[PDB]
């Protein structure tokens, strides 16, 4: 898909 804007905080 596309990356969500705060993805890094949920990895």
């Amino acid at each position, epitope marked *: 898909k*596309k*990356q*969500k*804007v*705060h*993805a*890094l*905080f*949920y*990895k």
Partner: antibody
Amino acid sequence: VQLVESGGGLVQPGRSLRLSCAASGFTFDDGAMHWVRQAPGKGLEWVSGISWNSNIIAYADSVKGRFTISRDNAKNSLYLEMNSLRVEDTALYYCAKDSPRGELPLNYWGQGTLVTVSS
Amino acid sequence: DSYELTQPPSVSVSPGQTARITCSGDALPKNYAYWYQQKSGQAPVLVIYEDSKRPSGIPERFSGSSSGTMATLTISGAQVEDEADYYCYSTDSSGNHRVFGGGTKLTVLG
């Protein structure tokens, strides 16, 4: 549900402030929390963010090395330690919270606390 | 300067007409766009997430799309209460930057 910021004030360049944000009415989910600032009459700027367990932290390039974010869920509080303040750090500072898993980013906002850096 | 999202500074629409606000960004093909509405003296409110999804409580006249390097917020049948500043928000692929567009002042002409 409520976010309430405090700690803003007037300081000279090079000095420090510590902002706080008290959260009320939230259950214990994985939503990340953030600081977003806005200079008078100008646009929004993301400043810093922190994961639910504080394991992941990030900063805008403009504040890296000067600002430090932290979070103590036991006191329902979010903090921003701002050191080596610059005139261009002058802004209204908002605290904000994501919905779970970051699906709705910055879903909840406070009212803002005013920071003025002036010589 | 940093990674940049570009918006028109101002858009004006007559009541009942369709308003379109664009947001151009090089990483938009690979990263979702989000839109915030901010009225004078108020905190921002999320109105569109993940390019095209509407949060609960947001009227159906609000819609979003993204194609290539441009995201668009559309308000079909603009109402006077829609007058506000609108900001797009996204990240670059590396996740190094989370940035807002410069904002668009939407005037619903009165």
